[PDB]
Amino acid sequence: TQDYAFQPGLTVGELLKSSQKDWQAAINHRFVKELFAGTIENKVLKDYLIQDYHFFDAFLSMLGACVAHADKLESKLRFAKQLGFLEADEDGYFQKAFKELKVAENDYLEVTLHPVTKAFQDLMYSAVASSDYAHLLVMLVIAEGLYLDWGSKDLALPEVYIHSEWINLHRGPFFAEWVQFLVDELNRVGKRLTELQQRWNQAVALELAFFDIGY
Amino acid sequence: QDYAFQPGLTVGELLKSSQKDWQAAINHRFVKELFAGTIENKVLKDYLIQDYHFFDAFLSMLGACVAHADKLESKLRFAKQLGFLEADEDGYFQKAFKELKVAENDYLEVTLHPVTKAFQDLMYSAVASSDYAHLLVMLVIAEGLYLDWGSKDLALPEVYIHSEWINLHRGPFFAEWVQFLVDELNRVGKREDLTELQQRWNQAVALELAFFDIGY
Ligand SMILES: [Mg+2]
Numbered sequence: 040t041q042d043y044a045f046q047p048g049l050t051v052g053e054l055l056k057s058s059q060k061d062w063q064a065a066i067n068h069r070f071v072k073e074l075f076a077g078t079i080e081n082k083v084l085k086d087y088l089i090q091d092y093h094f095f096d097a098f099l100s101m102l103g104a105c106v107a108h109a110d111k112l113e114s115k116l117r118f119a120k121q122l123g124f125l126e127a128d129e130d131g132y133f134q135k136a137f138k139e140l141k142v143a144e145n146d147y148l149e150v151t152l153h154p155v156t157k158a159f160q161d162l163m164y165s166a167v168a169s170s171d172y173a174h175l176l177v178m179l180v181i182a183e184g185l186y187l188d189w190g191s192k193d194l195a196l197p198e199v200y201i202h203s204e205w206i207n208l209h210r211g212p213f214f215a216e217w218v219q220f221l222v223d224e225l226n227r228v229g230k231r232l233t234e235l236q237q238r239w240n241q242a243v244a245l246e247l248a249f250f251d252i253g254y
Numbered sequence: 255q256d257y258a259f260q261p262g263l264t265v266g267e268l269l270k271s272s273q274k275d276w277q278a279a280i281n282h283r284f285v286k287e288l289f290a291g292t293i294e295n296k297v298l299k300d301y302l303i304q305d306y307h308f309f310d311a312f313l314s315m316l317g318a319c320v321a322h323a324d325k326l327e328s329k330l331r332f333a334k335q336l337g338f339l340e341a342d343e344d345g346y347f348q349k350a351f352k353e354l355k356v357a358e359n360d361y362l363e364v365t366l367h368p369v370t371k372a373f374q375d376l377m378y379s380a381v382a383s384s385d386y387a388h389l390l391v392m393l394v395i396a397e398g399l400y401l402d403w404g405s406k407d408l409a410l411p412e413v414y415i416h417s418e419w420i421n422l423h424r425g426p427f428f429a430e431w432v433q434f435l436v437d438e439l440n441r442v443g444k445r446e447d448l449t450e451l452q453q454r455w456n457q458a459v460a461l462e463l464a465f466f467d468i469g470y
Contacts, residue, residue, distance in 0.1 A: 099330070104320075115317070119316075119336035119337060122334075122336045123333060123336055
C-alpha cells in the first residue's frame with residue numbers, strides 16, 4: 040500500500056516490501072528537505088557531491104555493464120541513450136557545481152572515499168562482476184527509483200542552480216520514464232529471489248546512509 | 255603505410271601484421287560501389303541486416319568499456335559515443351530498413367551469416383575478458399578501419415542510404431573518436447600478452463574484410 044513515484048509491478052513490488060523503513064527514511068532525509076528549501080550548507084552539499092561523483096563513476100560502469108549484458112537490443116539502446124544524457128547533463132552539472140563550490144579537479148578526483156562510498160562501490164562492482172543483468176537492475180532500480188521518489192516531492196524548487204539542478208536531474212517525465220523502464224526490465228527478467236533481495240536490502244540501506252555523509 | 259589516424263607505438267606495431275587484409279577491406283567492392291552510388295539495393299540490404307547484428311554486439315563492447323575502463327574521463331567518452339550511436343546510427347538503420355522495405359522481424363529475427371557469428375563470438379569474448387585492452391583492439395579496428403574507408407578522397411554519393419553510412423564514419427567527430435581509441439590502446443597496451451592481443455587483432459581485421467563479402 041506504500042505509493043511510489045513509479046509503478047512497482049510484481050517483482051519490484053515484492054522486493055520493496057522489506058526495505059520500506061530505509062526507503063522512506065531516505066526520501067524524507069534532512070538532506071532532501073534542506074536541498075529543496077535551498078538552506079543546505081555549502082560544506083554539506085560539497086562533501087556529498089565529492090563522494091557522489093565517485094558513486095557516479097561506478098554508476099556509469101553499471102549502466103555500461105547493462106549495455107554489455109542485457110538480452111534485448113532495445114534495452115541496450117535505452118541504456119546507451121541514458122549514458123549520453125548522463126555524460127552531457129549530469130557530468131555537466133558536477134563540473135559546474137564543483138566550480139561554484141571552489142573544488143579543484145584534484146580535490147574531487149583524488150579523494151578519501153567515505154566508508155559508505157567504498158561499500159557502495161564494492162556492491163556496485165560486484166554487480167558488474169556478476170555479468171548478471173538482474174543484479175545490475177536491482178542496483179539501478181534502487182539508485183534511480185529512490186532518487187525519483189525524493190526528486191518528485193511536492194516542494195517548490197529552490198532558486199540557486201547548484202540546488203535546483205540536482206533536483207531537476209532526478210525529476211520530470213524523462214527521468215520518470217527511465218525509472219519505469221528499469222522497473223519494467225527488472226520485472227521482466229526477475230520473473231527467476233534470495234540473493235537479489237539481500238543485495239536490494241543492502242543497497243537501499245546504503246542510499247540512506249549516503250545522505251548522512253555531508254553532516 | 256599511411257592511415258586516417260595516427261597509429262602511435264602499440265597500434266602501429268599491431269597494424270604491421272594485418273596490412274594485406276586491412277588494405278583489401280578499405281578498397282573492397284562494397285566501399286567502391288557505396289561511394290559511386292552504384293551498389294545494388296539487395297547487396298546493401300543484406301549487409302545492413304547483418305551489420306545491425308554486428309551493431310548489437312558493438313554496443314555491448316562499448317558498454318563493457320564503460321564498465322572496465324580505468325579512467326572516468328574514458329568512461330565518459332564511451333558514454334558520449336553510446337548516446338551518439340543510439341541517436342544517429344540507430345536512426346540511420348531504422349531509416350535505411352524503412353527505405354529498403356525490411357520489416358522489423360526481417361532485420362531482428364534472421365539467419366546470422368557465418369562471418370557475423372564468428373565476429374559476435376570474438377566480440378563477446380572481448381566482453382567476457384573484462385579486459386579493456388582486448389576490447390580496445392576490437393574497437394580500434396572496427397572504428398579505425400571504417401574511418402580509413404569513410405575518409406576516402408571522394409565526394410559523397412547522392413542517395414541518403416548511401417551517403418549517411420559513409421557520413422557516420424567520416425569527419426572530425428568520428429576522426430577524433432578514433433584517435434581517442436587509438437590513444438587509449440597505446441596508453442594501456444604499452445602488456446605481457448601482446449601475442450594474444452595480436453591474435454585477436456589479426457582475426458578481427460580478417461573478419462572486417464570478410465564482412466564486406468556478405469552482401470555479394
Ligand atoms: Mg524550495
